[PDB]
Amino acid sequence: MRVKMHVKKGDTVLVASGKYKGRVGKVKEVLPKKYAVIVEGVNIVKKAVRVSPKYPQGGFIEKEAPLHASKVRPICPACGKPTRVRKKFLENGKKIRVCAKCGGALDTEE
Amino acid sequence: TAYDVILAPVLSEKAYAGFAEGKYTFWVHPKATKTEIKNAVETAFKVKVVKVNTLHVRGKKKRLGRYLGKRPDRKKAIVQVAPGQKIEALEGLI
Amino acid sequence: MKEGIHPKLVPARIICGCGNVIETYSTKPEIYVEVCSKCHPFYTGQQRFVDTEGRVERFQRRYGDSYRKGR
Amino acid sequence: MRKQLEEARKLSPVELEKLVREKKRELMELRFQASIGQLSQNHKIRDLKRQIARLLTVLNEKRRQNA
RNA sequence: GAGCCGGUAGCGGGCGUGGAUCCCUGGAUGUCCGAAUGGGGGAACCCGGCCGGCGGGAACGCCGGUCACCGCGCUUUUGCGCGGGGGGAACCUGGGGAACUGAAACAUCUCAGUACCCAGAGGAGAGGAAAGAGAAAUCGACUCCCUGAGUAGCGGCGAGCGAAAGGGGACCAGCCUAAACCGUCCGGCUUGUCCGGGCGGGGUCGUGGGGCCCUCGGACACCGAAUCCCCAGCCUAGCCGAAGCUGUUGGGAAGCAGCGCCAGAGAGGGUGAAAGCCCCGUAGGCGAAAGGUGGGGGGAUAGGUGAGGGUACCCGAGUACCCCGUGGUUCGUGGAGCCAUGGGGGAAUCUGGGCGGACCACCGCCUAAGGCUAAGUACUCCGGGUGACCGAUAGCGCACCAGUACCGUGAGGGAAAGGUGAAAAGAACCCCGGGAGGGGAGUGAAAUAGAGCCUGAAACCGUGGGCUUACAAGCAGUCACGGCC
RNA sequence: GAGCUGGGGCUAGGAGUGAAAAGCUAACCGAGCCCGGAGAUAGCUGGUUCUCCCCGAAAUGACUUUAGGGUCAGCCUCAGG
RNA sequence: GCGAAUGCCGGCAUGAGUAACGAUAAAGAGGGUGAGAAUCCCUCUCGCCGUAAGCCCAAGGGUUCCUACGCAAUGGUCGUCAGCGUAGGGUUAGGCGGGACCUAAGGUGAAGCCGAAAGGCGUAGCCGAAGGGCAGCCGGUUAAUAUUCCGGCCCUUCCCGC
RNA sequence: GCCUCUAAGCACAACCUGCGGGAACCCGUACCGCAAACCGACACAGGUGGGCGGGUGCAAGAGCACUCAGGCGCGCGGGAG
């Protein structure tokens, strides 16, 4: 929870909470990890204006806080990422690995 | 440095009518020598700068929640046409 | 400073005062003058070569002038 | 606009000079804009400024080393 | 490593895995004042002289390079080319330098050479290689600690103030210059042979330098930055990185239950209530760069040190020494010495000359009246770490738009105010109303958690219920009793 | 008129001025005001906190620039004997 | 580990709903606007100034001035009024003034005399005044300001030429 | 400012003078402003520099009384008394 995160717009589950059912890590902040899961909000029964529709009420309510999130998962759900072993030239490749493995890999999926 | 760029149009109502009649008012770098003014004016808008007056006004009075401020400083000055030219866009538009 | 010496300072301090004798001749001290003071010399002149001055300080003077006198 | 960085490197005295000049005029124009387009404008402001800035940093650099 | 346009959302707009925000190092102009210096000037502003440019050229007007003052060295020629200066919480050196209060007064005495004003050096200055110590026949630079005695001792001997050698510990280089002797020299005056100015040999260290004779002599010693090259050390960014899920009461869960896990890392914070395996890039260890600081270890660069007896002497500073006026010293006046100077006197070459017993006769001690820095104690602006150190009236006054509000002429003075909630989900819409603010509905675990909105007690003010009260003088109360409820 | 008065300046707090009572000197200067030596001195008064248990004081001697203060003495309390 | 120090900081009562509303220069009516107007707006009665409560320049103030909204705060109450709050817009001059010029007292200060240091003193030159000196005035136009804008009239100095 | 000579240039392009043509920047204004905007900690009846201070009346006149312009009716009201 600092200038150094966990999973990014990537995807995973919730341990202690209200859903567990893992999904879309919509986006996450650099300091307060502050991240959205598209799972568990409200409506804000908003405005009286047209800002929110001529008949105003916030729509998608979801800004996810707790870090109990059940971060990433290869052919292995509840996990904790590794680092790399490179093998390649200028091979940061801090893939996501241990038990099963998930790297993100700029192809087929984030 | 050495970049002639020095102004902000006089978007002021009153001043509008003058623009209309044959001269126009603006705001500019709080310092433009009056001659610096005829030059900016001339080379700038390809005009024939005839007479320029200079006025300044600071922004006294703007409250800010727990603390307060006033505003920075606004420099106003006016320059007349010569025939009734230039400032086209500006004026015609409004 | 605009009043030292030229050939080596002398513009200086001094704490003084007194009492009364008798001492090893019938008595002890006699003391009561916590006072402070000054302390100095003089001033004179001669010539570089057809135009000059001197300034300086008494003694060290006599020596000196003799000296630069040698040239 | 590392690109800009490129043509940058590229020009030199007179060029850079009159070029950045004109440009700055351009931005000036934007300034008069402070009241019309706006919305999309944002950028012209931040960046255009930046670009011109570069122009400067540049002549500085080049004739800098020059003398 | 993949989000970011600070603190700010919000509007209205964006750039970026063809290393975006951003962490450090070098940059680049760098508004005007400010030691300010081109001139003036109540700073943060108005003047102008020189060369460059752009404008309708010139008189106007900007960007521009420009133009104090001081001492300092050089070409003194007309002078072009170096340096300073201005700051800085506390420590440093010197410069000048005070009453209280004590001595139950108070004049010597005392706080003290402290407070305090100034100049100035630093990153530490200071001192720093013995006219030293001390008395045995030794010591051996200077600085800082403990011991030295609170004795030796200092004094209306009263209040008090109060050593030093040694010893123990740390930190251990010792080097230089005029010293005219000499030579050569450049200038001399005047000529020959003095003095002045260079480079030298000597360029003293525990005293010899040198000039004369001979004995000489032909590779280790490195700088108090001598100096230069790297392991550069940090600066700020790194990196990995030990092992649990199931269940369960629960708004919760890490708890309570079942088993399964780690540990050269059960230090901590953090995740909706008390997690070694959920959060931390830590203690576990490892991490590193082309920039900015060297004690190292090493080299090379090493200026410059590094013999023997003889002989007529020339050779470290104008002042020691002596008298009086005074400072320092544990001494206040004294039988009072040494060092330190202000006055008048005013010299010696090491058979010299001060220093130990005022002073005399002795032995002894040292070699001064030039210069050089190291290293061991000080300090705290600033970084980091720790606290039988504090909880928001103690803590820095100062926990965050307080050195600012505000009072004062200036000097100067100098507060208050922290904690809504797990997270904004923080209040649609309907109902009285000018609003506010009040009633509902939804949030929600609570909202008598609701925007100063945690916990929110005492004072005092309210609305309701029991008892109570109009022949009565009592701080209070309170012992008894009866009537109420 | 030794008048009154605006603007400009020069002198200051042991010193200023002072047609002088001790006058005035940023609103009560017989010696300015802020900061500092300072937390001065303060035999003078104020104040000098939980409970309980024992005992139980002297409100005089003596000299003191002391005399509504102290030093030594009488009375007290705790421990040994 | 505390009544207690006319103590310290911060609440809180008490007089007390009496004292008091800032000048004895007076009001009163009608319509009006408004949620509400003794206390705002227009209008009709009446008193007080008038050499001043009137005009003006300058000083010192520095927002404010206007136009639109607004009052919960602030006016010693009221209040839909304001210098209040919010937003916007508002002042410009070759000949007004100040400097682009002059010196006074007086301050500074190349030099000079000066001190234990920090300074003292100080010619010259400089800085320093609604004091010296210097080229216009009147009539018109905005919510607003003007011998500054417009216009009509009279100039001013320096530059190039001739 | 008028003159008035050095330097010295002028005097061949210096100064007085006509006309034409070209120029001429900085800061300043608004409103209060004998006062609820300036000074008294307040919309404090205190103070504060020059400019005519309209008219009628009185011997005289910035005193007087009514007033001209212009400016107010003092910022809490009503009620007996």
Phi-psi region of D33 (alpha: psi -120 to 50; beta: other; left: phi over 0): alpha
Q: In chain B, how long is the greatest CA-to-CA distance? A: 53
CB contact under 8 A, D28 and B1: no
Residue by residue, DSSP assigns C6-61 as SSS------EE--B---GGGT----B---EE-------EEEESSSSEEEE--HHHH
CB contact under 8 A, B4 and D34: no
Q: Give residues with Cβ within 8 angstroms of A97, minimum separation 6.
A: A74, A81, A82, A103
Q: A28 in helix, strand or coil?
A: strand
Cα–Cα distance between B54 and B79 in angstroms, integer?
A: 9
Q: A105 in helix, strand or coil?
A: coil
Neighbours of chain A (3+ CB pairs under 8 A): none
Domains of chain B, residue spans: 1-94
Tally the residues of chain B.
Answer: 94
Cα–Cα distance between A107 and A92 in angstroms, integer?
A: 17
Phi-psi region of D32 (alpha: psi -120 to 50; beta: other; left: phi over 0): alpha
Tally the residues of chain D.
Answer: 67
Cα–Cα distance between D54 and D50 in angstroms, integer?
A: 6
Q: Please name the method used to determine this structure.
A: X-ray
C46, amino acid identity: Q
Cα–Cα distance between C70 and D2 in angstroms, integer?
A: 80
C36, amino acid identity: C
Find where tokens 């727990």 sit. B66
Q: A24 in helix, strand or coil?
A: strand
CATH match for B1-94 among 3.30.70.330, 3.40.640.10, 1.20.1250.20, 3.40.47.10: 3.30.70.330
Interface test with D, best of B5, B11, B19 (most D CBs within 10 A): B5
Q: Which nucleotides of E are covered by protein (CB under 7 A)?
A: 1-5, 12-19, 21-22, 27-30, 54-56, 59-64, 95-98, 107-109, 113, 155-156, 195-196, 238-241, 244-246, 250-254, 270-272, 275, 277-281, 318-319, 325-328, 332-335, 341-346, 401-402, 422-429, 442-444
Answer positive or negative: Cα dihedral of C25, C27, C29, C32: negative
CB B29 within 8 A of CB B47: no
CB B27 within 8 A of CB B40: no
**Which residues in chain D are closer than 8 Å to B92, comparing Cβ atoms?**
none
